[PDB]
RNA sequence: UUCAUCUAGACAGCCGGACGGUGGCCAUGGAAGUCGGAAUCCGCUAAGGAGUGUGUAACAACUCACCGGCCGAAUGAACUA
């Protein structure tokens, strides 16, 4: 607690070699998720490969990259946000945003954080007796006394995404037990060898490229059944086109054989 | 088929399907260039929509 | 597309990875490759069975 | 949770359990049998039992724990009678004791490795 | 003037975060972070002190420590004339 280290260029020496030890490293956001949800994200990751500290001792990404031939400067706009971490993995880059980004666990919106989401509140009975239902009232949540309970009288949304939550407007949700984002370890950027991935990136689509496979598998299909070029899958098909355009003849015409 | 696949790469990459190109790609993939089925691969596509063949199909 | 196909015609084959064979199939195309397109398309890749996803047609 | 102090063996005070009120959510005594068959041996210095209420239970958060994991092993009840230098008693554990006592800690602690379990109970079993 | 803190980013303000060994021995009706009185290790580790103040008979929260950002260049404490 008291004045000695607290260290500096010290606690930055044992975090140069730790970007240097690692191939993959990762730019990541605590902001939102509780420590028994971090704590608890942090030792998967553990197992596997490790989290460590820094300010500004984190931006020195730079003296990391000085020991070696790899960044500078050079790099598109120092990603770094509030509240942010580096991870230093063997962990390819694309399982450890699957690891992360999905398993999230969940906790309350906070007074004055922007929402992520749309937030709604629901209709029904509060449960709770008459007192200062005002209050309800005065954040654009509509509710009256039905049968001597408070109840909210629709559904609506009280706050959009990308909209700040009012500190009123926190605390009464709080009170209804209305919570439910996801929280857990944002990832705001990764490093490997040499190149630079943005979040967009790594939100990893997938299904997409199914669709894609399979119309790519499609087209291959296509051209192999009606170019006839008979390795395995194609050749029963080419066969049926050459009739297909026979039996089809007659179809139109007017010789009965 | 690796001959159709390496057409339709060759198609959407906009280089011409021949068989020095078809060659190429058929190399860098680590499959033995054989002469007759390129040739004959090349003759198919001949006088081809690549794009009207690609889409319809049962 | 480039990508989509380079993979596939390496299945026919019967192997594939990012440097290895994708980076060599589309420079054999004489394309200059966007990593970012490999990394999302082998990390799509991992622990799918291609064949499988074949056996329906879309 | 609202929290409560506890002594070994203890049932049915007036002053630790009407005013704290009776868990089970009403009816101690029903709390009062519970805590009681738990508290083990005699009572030493007090632990923290914590109150915790569910609709018609109740369930209390008590370690005396890992400390009396090891009085359990060494088969000594005190604690360090002269702090930090040498106890007056001499329960040396063995480095077998610890990484056993450490192994069933494990789920209860949060700790990464085995090897850093050891060092979190060795730390407690010092001082 | 003298001692400390600052481009490794201080400072005014505003903004923001906290899992786990584990509610710690003595004594007493009673201390359990915070009436009195011990040692003080460690996990993991941006970070998360056996704790800064606000409590109740005693227990019972919330903040702060410690840590991060928005800004950018000096800074405050002691004496002396």
Known sequence: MGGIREKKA???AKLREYLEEYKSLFVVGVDNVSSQQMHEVRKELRGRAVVLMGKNTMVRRAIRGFLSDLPDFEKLLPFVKGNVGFVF??????????????????APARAGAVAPEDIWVRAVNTGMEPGKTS???????????????????????????????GQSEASLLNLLNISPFTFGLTVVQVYDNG???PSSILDITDEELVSHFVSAVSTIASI?????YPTLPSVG????????????????????Y | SALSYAALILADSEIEISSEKLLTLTNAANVPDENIWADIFAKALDGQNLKDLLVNFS | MKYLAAYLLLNAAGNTPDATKIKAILESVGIEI????????????????????????? | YLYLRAVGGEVGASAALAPKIGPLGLSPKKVGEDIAKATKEFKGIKVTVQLKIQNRQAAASVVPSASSLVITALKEPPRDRKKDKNVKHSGNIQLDEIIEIARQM??????????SVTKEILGTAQS
């Open chain 1, 135 to 165: 209050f309800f009232q005065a954040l654009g949540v509509p509710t009256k006394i039905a049968r001597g309970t408070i109840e909210i009288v629709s559904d609506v949304k009280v706050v959009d995404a990308g909209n700040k939550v």
């Open chain 1, 89 to 106: 993995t063997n962990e390819p880059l694309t399982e450890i945003k699957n690891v992360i980004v999905s398993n999230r666990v969940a």
């Open chain 1, 195 to 197: 190149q630079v991935f």
């Open chain 1, 224 to 228: 192999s059944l009606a170019i006839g």
């Open chain 1, 10 to 12: 010290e606690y930055f």
């Open chain 1, 237 to 256: 098909h080419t066969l049926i086109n050459n009739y297909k355009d026979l039996l089809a003849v007659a179809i139109a015409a007017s010789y009965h």
């Open chain 3, 34 to 58: 966007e990593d970012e397109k490999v990394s999302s398309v082998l990390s799509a890749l991992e622990g799918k069975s291609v064949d499988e996803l074949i056996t329906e047609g879309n």
């Open chain 4, 106 to 115: 494990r789920d209860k602690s949060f700790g990464r490795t085995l090897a």
